[PDB]
Amino acid sequence: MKIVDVLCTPGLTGFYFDDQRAIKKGAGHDGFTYTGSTVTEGFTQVRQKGESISVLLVLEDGQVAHGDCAAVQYSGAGGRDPLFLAKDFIPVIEKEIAPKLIGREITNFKPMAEEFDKMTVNGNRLHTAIRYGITQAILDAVAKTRKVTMAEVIRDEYNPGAEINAVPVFAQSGDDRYDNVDKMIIKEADVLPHALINNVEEKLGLKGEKLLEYVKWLRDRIIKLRVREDYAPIFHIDVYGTIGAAFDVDIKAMADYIQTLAEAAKPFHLRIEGPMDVEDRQKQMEAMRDLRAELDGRGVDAELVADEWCNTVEDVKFFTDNKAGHMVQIKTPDLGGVNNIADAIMYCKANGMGAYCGGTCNETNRSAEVTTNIGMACGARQVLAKPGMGVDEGMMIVKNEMNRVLALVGRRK
């Protein structure tokens, strides 16, 4: 079965491109918009629409494979490829990638994904977002040629012999950490609620007091609102290094604190993401490793999730090999080729590290469907409800995909 044509179309995403440099310089607020000059190349407004590119691969039998190129909210920020505007990147795909796809016979997913993940143009690697979209599309093409699910393809090629099962769905709140929690409990999210604890003063509490009360509140809210007694979700709070800042990165003080959180969450289990945020990758790994070791020795079952300084596949292995935390966030759009996702999840698993198949609020419904399939195939510890900040829609997209995938796999199981 060959690819016979390739089409690219601009699109929207679940959120916005935001000029992080400008917002850190002091951009003020005006309704949903930000005021002031932009600072980052390519931005025309501090907040502007997110963009995506749909890549369609028409197959010789008439079927259409579909992937979505997309980037994080802080596109073009320090360390990222340039602002992902459809108009700047559609020409690259049409001129440089399409001619290498048309006429190609559809093989196994892995060799083709790897080729496209690493391909260069004028000696330079392609934007992460282009690699993300093209590889999704290749995955969909392989699945449609074989007449199986994406999940099945990945499982065959990366996790052979494994059962494909439901994966816990994690939902994120933004700053709207009380009302969005209610939505999560009514829809029975398996993991919640992120809570965006990104300010020491206003959100953690200078001494961690506010987050302590929030955990207590969350605990109570779940018991009060849950439809069924046996809904027992996992708490996962992202603290953006604030625990480090509030406690001077003192391993001891950080552990004592986290221990009170875990006590407060009882009966629910607690995952804390990004407790500290240090200056180098090496020192980040060191702190996460040693904090895990201290919690682990005291028999405090609270888990740490690595995120800060862990971006690439190499980093995922760096953190995994050093047991620097209990779980790793796999930042899907940032890894480029979706084959990297599967490799990262299987690597984490081989070393006993829980893989959090993440993503961004600024990607799409299609890209969420594709990574959901990857996370299920590799036995990820959890997957992110995405895209968007509405909560409902991201939970819908990911859960409904999961259920359908399980149904179809069941017919062959």
Feature table: binding site for (2S,3S)-3-methyl-L-aspartate: 172, 329, 360-361
The C-alpha atoms of residue 381 and residue 169 are separated, in whole angstroms, by 9
Work out whether 387 is an interface residue with its own copies (CB under 8 A). yes
Annotated binding site: 172, 238, 273, 307, 329, 360-361
CB of residue 408 to its own copies, shortest distance in Å: 7
Shortest CB 107 distance to its own copies, Å: 18
Catalytic residue among 331, 349, 399, 413: 331
CA pair distance 96, 115, nearest whole angstrom: 13
396 binds its own copies (CB under 8 A): yes
Q: Which one, 178 or 268, has the nearer CB to its own copies?
A: 178
Stretches 107-115, 155-163, 219-227, 331-339: which one binds its own copies (CB under 8 A)?
219-227
Element (H, E) at 303: strand 303-306
**What's the min distance (Å) between Cβ of 233 and its own copies?**
14
Among 19, 68, 117, 277, the residue binding its own copies under the rule CB under 8 A is 68
Instruction: List the structure tokens of 87.
Output: 């108009």
Question: Would you call the peptide bond into 267 cis, given omega within 30 degrees of 0 as the criterion?
Answer: yes
CA distances from 7 to 39, 66, 116, 262, 269 (A): 33, 10, 16, 51, 46
2 interacts with its own copies by CB under 8 A: no
CB of residue 49 vs its own copies: minimum separation in angstroms?
5
38 near its own copies (CB under 8 A): no
Catalytic, 216? Answer no
Assess 227 for contact with its own copies (CB under 8 A): yes
- Region near its own copies per CB under 8 A, out of 101-109, 111-119, 265-273, 382-390: 382-390
- Rank residues 117 and 156 by Cβ distance to its own copies and give the closer one: 156
60 lines the binding site for its own copies (CB under 8 A): no
- 75 contributes a contact to its own copies by CB under 8 A: no
Breaks (C-N over 2.5 A) in the chain follow: none
Residue 202 DSSP class: I
Q: Which of 325, 218, 320, 347 is nearest to 271 (CA)?
A: 325
b/e burial code for range 62-100 (CB count within 10 A of at least 16 → b): eeebbbbbbbbbbbbbeebbebbbbeebbebbeeebbee
- Our finding on whether 395 is near its own copies (CB under 8 A) is yes
d(CA 193, CA 180): 8
Which residue of 26, 120, 147, 163 would you call a contact of its own copies, by CB under 8 A?
Answer: 147
- Name residues contacting its own copies, limited to 158-197 (CB under 8 A): 178-183, 186-188
Phi and psi torsions of 55, nearest 5°: -115, 120
Does residue 151 touch its own copies according to CB under 8 A?
no
How far apart CA 134 and CA 118 sit, in angstroms, is 12
The binder of its own copies chosen from 207, 252, 283, 404 (CB under 8 A): 404
Pairing between β-strand 191-194 and β-strand 16-18 as defined by DSSP bridges: unpaired
Based on the shown chain and the rule CB under 8 A, indicate whether residue 66 belongs to the binding site for its own copies.
Answer: yes
**Which residue of 36, 38, 39, 63 would you call a contact of its own copies, by CB under 8 A?**
63
Q: Which of 20, 40, 54, 339 binds its own copies (CB under 8 A)?
A: 54
Our CB check for its own copies shows the closer of 302 and 398 to be: 398
Question: Nearer to its own copies by C-beta: 59 or 239?
Answer: 59
Which is nearer to its own copies, 223 or 225 (by Cβ)?
225
Closest CA to 313 of 290, 336, 292: 336
Contact pick of 40, 48, 340, 360 for its own copies (by CB under 8 A): 48
The CB-side HSE value for 215 (13 A sphere, CA atoms) comes to 28
Q: Tell me the residue ranges of DSSP E strands in 146-233.
A: 169-170, 191-194
Backbone angles phi, psi at 211, to 5 degrees: -60, -35
Q: Does 393 bind its own copies (CB under 8 A)?
A: yes
The shares of helix, strand and coil residues in the chain, as percent rounded to the nearest 5, are 45, 15, 40
The amino acid at 126 = L
Is position 198 an interface residue for its own copies (rule: CB under 8 A)? no
Provide the annotated active-site residues.
331
Give residues in contact with its own copies (CB under 8 A): 5, 7-16, 31-33, 44-45, 47-50, 52, 54, 56, 58, 61-64, 66, 68, 144, 147, 178-183, 186-188, 221, 225, 227, 364-366, 387-397, 399-400, 403-404, 406-408, 410-411
